[PDB]
Tab-separated table of C-alpha atoms in Angstrom:
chain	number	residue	atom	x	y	z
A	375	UNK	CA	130.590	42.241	82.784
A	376	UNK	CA	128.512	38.855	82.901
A	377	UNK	CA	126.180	38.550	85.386
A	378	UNK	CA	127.949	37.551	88.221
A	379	UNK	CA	131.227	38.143	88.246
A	380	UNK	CA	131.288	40.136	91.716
A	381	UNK	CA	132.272	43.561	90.381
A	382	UNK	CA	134.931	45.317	92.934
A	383	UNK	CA	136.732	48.378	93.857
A	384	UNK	CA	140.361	49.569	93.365
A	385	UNK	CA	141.445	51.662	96.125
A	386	UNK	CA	143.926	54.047	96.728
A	387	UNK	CA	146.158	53.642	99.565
A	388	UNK	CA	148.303	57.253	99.393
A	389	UNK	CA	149.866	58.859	102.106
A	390	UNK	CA	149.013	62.714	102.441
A	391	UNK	CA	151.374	64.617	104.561
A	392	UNK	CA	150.026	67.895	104.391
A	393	UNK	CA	150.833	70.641	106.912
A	394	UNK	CA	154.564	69.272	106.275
A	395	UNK	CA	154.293	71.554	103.143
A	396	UNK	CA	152.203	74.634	103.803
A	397	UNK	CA	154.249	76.263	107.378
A	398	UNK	CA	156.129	74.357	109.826
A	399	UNK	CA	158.878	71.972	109.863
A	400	UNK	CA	156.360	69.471	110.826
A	401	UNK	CA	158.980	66.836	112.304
A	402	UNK	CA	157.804	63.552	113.260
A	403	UNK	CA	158.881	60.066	115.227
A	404	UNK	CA	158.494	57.743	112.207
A	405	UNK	CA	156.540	54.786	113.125
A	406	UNK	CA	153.657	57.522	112.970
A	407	UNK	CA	150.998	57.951	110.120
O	1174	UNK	CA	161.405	106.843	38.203
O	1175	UNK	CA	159.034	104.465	40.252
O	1176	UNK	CA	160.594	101.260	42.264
O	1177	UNK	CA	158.770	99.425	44.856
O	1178	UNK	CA	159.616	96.706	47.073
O	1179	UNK	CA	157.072	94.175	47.475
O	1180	UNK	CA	155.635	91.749	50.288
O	1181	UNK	CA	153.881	89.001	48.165
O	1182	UNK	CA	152.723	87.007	50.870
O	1183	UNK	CA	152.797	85.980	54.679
O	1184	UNK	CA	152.088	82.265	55.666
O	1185	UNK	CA	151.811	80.671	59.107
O	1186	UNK	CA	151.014	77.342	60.326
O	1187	UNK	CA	148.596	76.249	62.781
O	1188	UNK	CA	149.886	74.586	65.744
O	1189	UNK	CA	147.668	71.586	65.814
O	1190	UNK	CA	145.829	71.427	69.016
O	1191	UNK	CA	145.510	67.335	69.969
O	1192	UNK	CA	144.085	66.317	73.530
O	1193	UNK	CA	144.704	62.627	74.626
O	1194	UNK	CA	141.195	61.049	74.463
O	1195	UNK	CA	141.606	60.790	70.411
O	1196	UNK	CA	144.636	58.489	70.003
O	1197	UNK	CA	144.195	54.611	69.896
O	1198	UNK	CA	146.516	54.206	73.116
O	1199	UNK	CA	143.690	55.856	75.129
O	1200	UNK	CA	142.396	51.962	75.653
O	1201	UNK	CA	145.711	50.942	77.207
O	1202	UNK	CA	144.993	52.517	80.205
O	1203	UNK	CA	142.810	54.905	82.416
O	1204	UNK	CA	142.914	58.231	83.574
O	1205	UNK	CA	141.698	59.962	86.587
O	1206	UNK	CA	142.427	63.599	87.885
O	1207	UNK	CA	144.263	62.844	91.669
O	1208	UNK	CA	145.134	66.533	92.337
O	1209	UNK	CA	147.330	66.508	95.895
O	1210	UNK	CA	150.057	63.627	94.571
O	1211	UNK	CA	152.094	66.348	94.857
O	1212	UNK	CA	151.701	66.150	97.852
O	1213	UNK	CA	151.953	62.193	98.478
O	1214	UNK	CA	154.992	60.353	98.230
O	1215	UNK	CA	153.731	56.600	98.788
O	1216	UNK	CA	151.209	55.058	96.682
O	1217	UNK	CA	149.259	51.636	97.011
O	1218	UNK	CA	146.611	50.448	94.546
O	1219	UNK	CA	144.959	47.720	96.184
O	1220	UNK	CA	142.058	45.898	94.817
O	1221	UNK	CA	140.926	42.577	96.186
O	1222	UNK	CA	141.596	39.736	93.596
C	635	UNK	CA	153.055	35.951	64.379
C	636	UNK	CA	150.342	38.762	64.900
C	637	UNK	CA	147.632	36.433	66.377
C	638	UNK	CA	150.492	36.007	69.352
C	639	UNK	CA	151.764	39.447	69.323
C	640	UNK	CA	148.044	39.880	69.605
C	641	UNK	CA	147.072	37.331	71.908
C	642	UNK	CA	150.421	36.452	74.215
C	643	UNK	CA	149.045	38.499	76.798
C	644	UNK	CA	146.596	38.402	80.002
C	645	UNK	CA	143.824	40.609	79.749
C	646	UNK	CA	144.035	43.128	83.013
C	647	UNK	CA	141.711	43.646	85.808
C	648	UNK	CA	139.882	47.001	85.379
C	649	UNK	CA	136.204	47.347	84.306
C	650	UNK	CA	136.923	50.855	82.876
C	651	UNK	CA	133.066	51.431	82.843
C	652	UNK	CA	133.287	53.523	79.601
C	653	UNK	CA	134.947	51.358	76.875
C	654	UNK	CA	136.166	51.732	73.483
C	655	UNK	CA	133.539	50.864	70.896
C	656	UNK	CA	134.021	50.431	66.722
C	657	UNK	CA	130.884	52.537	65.756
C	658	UNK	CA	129.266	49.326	65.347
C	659	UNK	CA	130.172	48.847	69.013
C	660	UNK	CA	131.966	46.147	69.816
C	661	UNK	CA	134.388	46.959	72.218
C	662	UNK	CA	138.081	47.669	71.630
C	663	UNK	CA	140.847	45.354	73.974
C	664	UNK	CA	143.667	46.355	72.454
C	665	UNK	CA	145.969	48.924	71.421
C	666	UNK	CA	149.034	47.931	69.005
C	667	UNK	CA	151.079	50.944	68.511
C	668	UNK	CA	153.766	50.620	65.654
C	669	UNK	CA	156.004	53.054	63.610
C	670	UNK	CA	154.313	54.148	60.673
C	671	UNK	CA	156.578	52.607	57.944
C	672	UNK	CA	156.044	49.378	59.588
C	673	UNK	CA	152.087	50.097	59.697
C	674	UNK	CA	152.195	50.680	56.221
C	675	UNK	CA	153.980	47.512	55.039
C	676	UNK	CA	151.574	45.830	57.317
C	677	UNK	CA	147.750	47.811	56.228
C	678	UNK	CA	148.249	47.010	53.143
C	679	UNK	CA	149.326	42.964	53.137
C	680	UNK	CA	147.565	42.245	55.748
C	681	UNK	CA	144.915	43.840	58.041
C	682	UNK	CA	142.225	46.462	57.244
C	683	UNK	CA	138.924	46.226	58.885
């Protein structure tokens, strides 16, 4: 890296149902997160 | 009267043990443990360019 | 034909922040996987640094 250069981060963007797996027939409207 | 019947040897191979970070192809990319995308469908990498 | 097999490419956006060095260390960008009767043909005529 030169100096400079303005270094970033790469982020994740995941979506975690949990709870859906585990118990329950977690049901949901959609349109939800 | 002696007769015997011999076992003149026994031979196995090793099972060569390799992990990933040896191999050349190690620079084309990166890896990162991410336990639970079992349990993620979606994915996004998003990195401001 | 090699420097643009080598070179036809854009070089990503990652910083890995652990690279590949030569022992020398300079850094590695590259990877170049082959089959090994081509890589033979082509050690020997042509690259072996």
């Amino acid at each position: 890296v030169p100096t400079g250069s303005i270094l970033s981060t790469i982020e994740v963007a995941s979506h975690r149902r949990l709870f859906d797996f585990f118990a329950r027939v977690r049901s949901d409207e959609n349109s939800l997160y | 009267d002696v007769e015997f019947d011999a076992l003149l040897g026994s031979y196995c191979n090793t099972l060569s043990l390799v992990r990933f970070l040896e191999l050349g192809l190690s620079v084309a990319c990166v890896c990162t443990k991410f336990p639970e995308l079992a349990y993620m469908n979606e994915g996004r990498v998003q990195f401001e360019v | 034909w090699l420097v643009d097999l080598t070179t036809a490419t854009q070089p990503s956006v990652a910083v890995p922040r652990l690279t590949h060095a030569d022992t020398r260390g300079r850094p590695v960008d590259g990877v170049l996987v082959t089959t090994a009767a081509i890589k033979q043909r082509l050690l020997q005529s042509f690259l072996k640094v």
